[model samples]
Target: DWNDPQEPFAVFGSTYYVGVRGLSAVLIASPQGHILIDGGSPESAPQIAQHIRQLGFKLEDVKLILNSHEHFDHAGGISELQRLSGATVLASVQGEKVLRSGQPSKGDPQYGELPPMTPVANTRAVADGEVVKLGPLAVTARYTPGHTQGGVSWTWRATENGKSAAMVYADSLNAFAAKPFRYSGSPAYPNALADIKKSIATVAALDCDILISAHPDAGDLWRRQARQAELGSAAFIDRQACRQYAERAGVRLQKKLAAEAAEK
Candidate 1:
């Protein structure tokens, strides 16, 4: 029932966007098939599958699947996708245990509710500075562990209209403002403010003309505005808006933490 358009939502130059609905999955296509970033939830898996089909690419062609973290919204469909596509699931070495166990980790509410995941046979453990190459695309994995101990971001180069661009970062920096579950009003994990700051700096230092996030929006707005004359300006703007929201969210969380610490 989701009427979101099919593949080829151009972001910056050669980068394209494909919505997975429900939770949010992004497919970044290069000359070498595609790289699926997140799998969304079980409920949205079928739609995501269909989206890929409509894009004229088979689920089997997805060479890699990476989760921002082990949260259900980001990883619930890993098992199904692995079964259908046979693509390797790459995750942080720290998160491998939970991911392969098919468990959502301790803080996530869905930890025990979801079905146990069959270990991805082709799973690869990655860390900061690891490079994953697919044809002309080279995605560098950076461990930006703050939201989760094994959180990662992928940075890749993009070429469009004979111009070069950068696609650095996926996953919103501010998505984890509160606790991981419903019952816990307090933060589930110790916030990695320092780590997050470092992660931000890492991305900022990149020559990224295009910033992509697991969520629909979240990128560098000012740079996007400057790239407006380019082919994928609208998509860039969408990501920029999301980035602004993420920036604001970070500020809000910092204020909350400071107030809570003061009271304590």
Candidate 2:
């Protein structure tokens, strides 16, 4: 049930959560144009477009679409979304290749487990510290390859009632590997383990005031939203969220490595 319907709501300031209940797609709205993050599963395309219109913004107003990774569940709807909005899609250098080819990169840890998505038409490769700008919005990309060879976490700022929040859209840090693929030592992706470790540390050190993971559940998005009436935006402003999430990912990676050791 990845495509369960969810009412689109404003997260904070101009940012709104417009994806399904399981996956997350966010909109950063502005007068000049809007920027969208992640398009959810393939079935999520029209639903996401509807959500955007429901939020009172036109689909054609979305000028830029950013990806968390090239996974089917996250980037699958981008092709249709791009066609609907005529926006340019952006991803990491390695991820750009996968998006254009409609195939998972062989270096991905879960390469064999993923399915091909509709090949995207207009895609640009983003550098590690590249800042994607659209009108007043400036989102910085942080390359975080672990679960996929081209994962990226994004950061931006939003303000509400004179208060500004440093928002972070964290990419998946799970050390998932397909059968016969080991993070400890894999010829296909020689730097898998090191890349994940660095990504974990990098996310832990971000200036994260409000953390929204690609999968909403990973960051307790609804759990915090439940308290929105009482705490206003403060409920989502936990400074330790990124650290906690990174710590959890670190623990999972350790357990995965341990399991690999036990098998040997």
Which candidate should be chosen as best, given TM-score against the real structure?
2
lDDT of 1: 0.61
Q: What number of clashing residue pairs does each candidate have, in the order they appear?
A: 3, 0
lDDT of 2 by residue, 152-218 (tens): 9999999999999999999999998887889989999999999999999999999999999998888
Q: What is the C-alpha lDDT of each candidate?
A: 0.61, 0.93
User: Candidate 1 lDDT, tens digit per residue, 9-52?
Assistant: 45665555555422456677765667887676655566677777
Q: How many angstroms is residue 124 displaced in model 1 relative to the true structure, after the best TM-score fit?
A: 1.1
Tell me which residue pairs clash in candidate 1. Answer: 171-214, 218-242, 218-243
Compared to the true structure, candidate 1 yields what TM-score? 0.75
Which sections of candidate 1 miss by over 4 Å? 1-8, 21-23, 30-32, 107-121, 175-191, 218-246
- What is the number of residue pairs that collide in model 2? 0
